[PDB]
Design a protein around this ligand. Structure first.
Ligand SMILES: CC(C)CCC[C@@H](C)[C@H]1CC[C@H]2[C@@H]3CC=C4C[C@@H](O)CC[C@]4(C)[C@H]3CC[C@]12C
Ligand SMILES: CC(C)CCC[C@@H](C)[C@H]1CC[C@H]2[C@@H]3CC=C4C[C@@H](O)CC[C@]4(C)[C@H]3CC[C@]12C
Ligand SMILES: CC(C)CCC[C@@H](C)[C@H]1CC[C@H]2[C@@H]3CC=C4C[C@@H](O)CC[C@]4(C)[C@H]3CC[C@]12C
Ligand SMILES: Nc1nc(NCCc2ccc(O)cc2)nc2nc(-c3ccco3)nn12
Ligand SMILES: CCCCCCCC/C=C\CCCCCCCC(=O)O
Ligand SMILES: CCCCCCCC/C=C\CCCCCCCC(=O)O
Ligand SMILES: CCCCCCCC/C=C\CCCCCCCC(=O)O
Ligand SMILES: CCCCCCCC/C=C\CCCCCCCC(=O)O
Ligand SMILES: CCCCCCCC/C=C\CCCCCCCC(=O)O
Ligand SMILES: CCCCCCCC/C=C\CCCCCCCC(=O)O
Ligand SMILES: CCCCCCCC/C=C\CCCCCCCC(=O)O
Ligand SMILES: CCCCCCCC/C=C\CCCCCCCC(=O)O
Ligand SMILES: CCCCCCCC/C=C\CCCCCCCC(=O)O
Ligand SMILES: CCCCCCCC/C=C\CCCCCCCC(=O)O
Ligand SMILES: CCCCCCCC/C=C\CCCCCCCC(=O)O
Ligand SMILES: CCCCCCCC/C=C\CCCCCCCC(=O)O
Ligand SMILES: CCCCCCCC/C=C\CCCCCCCC(=O)O
Ligand SMILES: CCCCCCCC/C=C\CCCCCCCC(=O)O
Ligand code: NA
Length: 390
């Protein structure tokens, strides 16, 4: 077999390349939020917490990963910290992603109550709690759920470690039942499915409110034609009363002026209809068309635009969650095979390190998603680049 130093030279070189890109891209994200006040909102404070975790992958997790690949001799609990620190960062990322999804769900479901419920001070408290919990979850093996008590004696002496020390290799010290049941199923898979559900509910909420808007508009147009071809006064009254309710639920969901005019003109044409005079009620109802073409349509178009922007923004953030799953699932699935099929040959070492490298590349991608999908980030990236390096 080829000397190990050659394959490991490739692995280390790729890891360092990834580390550099992870640091630089995510520093740019934090720099962007710091300088641009329009990026300083609660949503982007979770983005920054996420960027901080990805910087930490480059500065600490990748160096740790290089170290533990050598199988060096170490006190088992020190090795455990080297092996598990990345799990703290991945857990922090999951909490940040989950918080962003819930944030966007609150924004679209109760926007009038959003800024009252979701504040920067409460968000900062949530970020601190999530980091603390990330340390507890990621370092649980250090509390005793580990195989430090059953060291591999052959590797210990073949590597020449003193006693009290282990050959520091991930799968020798971190139990597979922890990685599969606790880390993967409970701490990764369940939150991922939760976020899938929240984003589904976001798109459904946006679709329902768009439909409601269109319904109210066609209800105001349909009943206009009804009034224009009516003949009994009860006819005109029935239609006008269905326009008033439609006009009010649209009011809830200088346009306060446009609707005052609309409601007033409906009330006018309504009191005429109650008095029997229909032709003058129809005449009064036909001026609604200019209030509609002058105010209501304009507001219904920008309400449509706002929802479309929220949906497009929700899609961009959902892409972040999908790429997280794509980059981390292979390693988890491999662990499932190692754990659940003792009759299977272990995944080959080159595939293990490909899966590790892939998980680390996730710390590089998010800055690119922001620049391509989010105008405010893209433009802030441009200004920073063209001004502070050229
Ligand atoms: C930059 C600062 C904030 C963080 C860096 C701290 C890192 C380098 C420190 C903190 C704890 C340290 C570990 C503590 C215990 C051991 C066991 C020993 O047998 C080998 C070294 C080893 C594995 C240390 C490696 C270095 C280590 C991981
Ligand atoms: C998108 C998410 C929900 C997909 C997660 C599905 C994972 C848990 C599934 C997909 C393929 C499955 C593996 C397929 C084959 C085997 C071999 C069998 O001898 C042990 C179970 C084992 C190892 C399965 C474990 C569970 C597994 C890894
Ligand atoms: C891109 C993501 C979503 C899907 C990738 C699925 C990958 C991780 C799956 C597809 C085929 C799987 C391999 C199929 C066969 C074996 C041989 C067995 O003795 C060890 C596990 C091992 C080596 C599996 C490891 C996991 C594996 C490589
Ligand atoms: N199984 C596993 N192994 C490693 N590194 C050890 C790779 C290895 C595996 C077997 C072997 O004989 C020599 C080396 N890192 C790992 N990281 C993870 C992981 C992180 C998050 C989810 O899974 N799993 N995982
Ligand atoms: C390190 C983490 C990123 C630090 C953010 C840098 C902000 C720079 C602000 C400035 O250039 O005036
Ligand atoms: C491990 C060492 C590296 C950990 C990352 C360190 C700090 C990340 C930057 C913290 C956020 C600073 C910017 C705040 C802001 O933009 O309002
Ligand atoms: C270990 C390295 C990471 C540790 C601490 C994470 C701190 C980053 C959180 C930044 C918060 C940004 C904000 O609240 O505005
Ligand atoms: C800022 C931190 C700068 C220091 C970073 C150092 C990391 C390299 C550690 C190298 C350990 C080599 C041990 C070799 C030996 O056993 O003699
Ligand atoms: C600039 C930074 C340069 C980093 C140098 C890379 C560190 C290399 C040391 C790891 C060597 C481990 C021995 C090979 C694995 C067996
Ligand atoms: C940046 C630092 C990246 C690489 C640090 C790798 C430290 C390697 C320690 C090897 C110890 C050993 O081989 O016994
Ligand atoms: C400024 C950020 C500092 C970055 C710190 C990262 C440095 C790499 C950390 C771990 C390498 C040290 C572990 C090597 C122990 C080998 C001891 C031995 O010979 O057994
Ligand atoms: C500020 C961050 C600095 C935190 C302190 C970091 C290093 C302390 C850990 C060093 C302990 C290594 C001893 C291992 C041994 O004796 O075998
Ligand atoms: C970083 C700051 C604290 C790091 C503490 C790491 C403690 C691990 C000690 C394990 C051991 O000594 O065997
Ligand atoms: C929920 C968050 C809880 C945070 C505090 C939890 C830590 C309590 C455990 C203290 C560390 C014990 C280490 C034991 C050991 O290293 O052998
Ligand atoms: C990268 C693309 C393909 C990786 C998945 C196929 C590798 C399976 C290897 C199975 C084996 O070597 O026993
Ligand atoms: C996706 C990014 C490109 C991936 C390029 C390939 C990277 C990993 C190949 C690993 C080669 C075998 C590593 C052996 C490690 C070892 O011997 O300790
Ligand atoms: C013995 C066979 C050695 C290794 C099989 C070749 C697999 C190498 C894949 C790493 C390169 C890559 O997929 O990008
Ligand atoms: C090894 C380094 C990891 C590289 C993969 C990570 C992210 C790739 C992002 C690709 C974006 C550049 C393509 C778009 C373009 O510039 O035309
Ligand atoms: Na991350």
């Amino acid at each position: 077999g080829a000397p190990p130093i050659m394959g490991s030279s490739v692995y280390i070189t790729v890891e360092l390349a990834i580390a550099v890109l992870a640091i630089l891209g995510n520093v740019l994200v934090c720099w962007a939020v710091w300088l641009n006040s329009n990026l300083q909102n609660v949503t982007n404070y979770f983005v920054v917490s996420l960027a901080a975790a990805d910087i930490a992958v480059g500065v600490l997790a990748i160096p740790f990963a290089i170290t533990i690949s050598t199988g060096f001799c170490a006190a088992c609990h020190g090795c455990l910290f080297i092996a598990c620190f990345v799990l703290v960062l991945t857990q922090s990322s999951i909490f940040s992603l989950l918080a962003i999804a819930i944030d966007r769900y609150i924004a679209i479901r109760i926007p009038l109550r959003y800024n009252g419920l979701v504040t920067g001070t409460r968000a900062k408290g949530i970020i601190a709690i999530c980091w603390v919990l990330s340390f507890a979850i990621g370092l649980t093996p250090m509390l005793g759920w580990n195989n430090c008590g059953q060291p591999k004696e052959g590797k210990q002496h073949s590597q020449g470690c003193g006693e009290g020390q282990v050959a520091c290799l991930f799968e020798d010290v971190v139990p597979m039942n922890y990685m599969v049941y606790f880390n993967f199923f409970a701490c990764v898979l369940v939150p991922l499915l939760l976020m899938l559900g929240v984003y589904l509910r976001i798109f459904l909420a946006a679709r329902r409110q768009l439909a409601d808007l269109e319904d109210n508009w066609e209800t105001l147009n349909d009943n206009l034609k009804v009034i224009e071809k009516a003949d009994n006064a009860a006819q005109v009254k029935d239609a006008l009363t269905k326009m008033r309710a439609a006009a009010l639920d649209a009011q809830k969901a200088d346009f306060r002026h446009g609707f005052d005019i609309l409601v007033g003109q409906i009330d006018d044409a309504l009191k005429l209809a109650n008095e029997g005079k229909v032709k003058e009620a129809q005449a009064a109802a036909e001026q609604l068309k200019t209030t509609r073409n002058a105010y209501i349509q304009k507001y219904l178009e920008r309400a449509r635009s706002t929802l479309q922007k929220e949906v497009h923004a929700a899609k961009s953030l959902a892409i972040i969650v999908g790429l997280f799953a794509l980059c981390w699932l292979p390693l988890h699935i491999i662990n499932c095979f190692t754990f659940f099929c003792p009759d299977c040959s272990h995944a080959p070492l080159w595939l293990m390190y490909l899966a590790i490298v892939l998980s680390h590349t996730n710390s590089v991608v998010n800055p690119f998603i922001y620049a391509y999908r989010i105008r405010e980030f893209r433009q802030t990236f441009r200004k920073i680049i063209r001004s502070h390096v050229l």
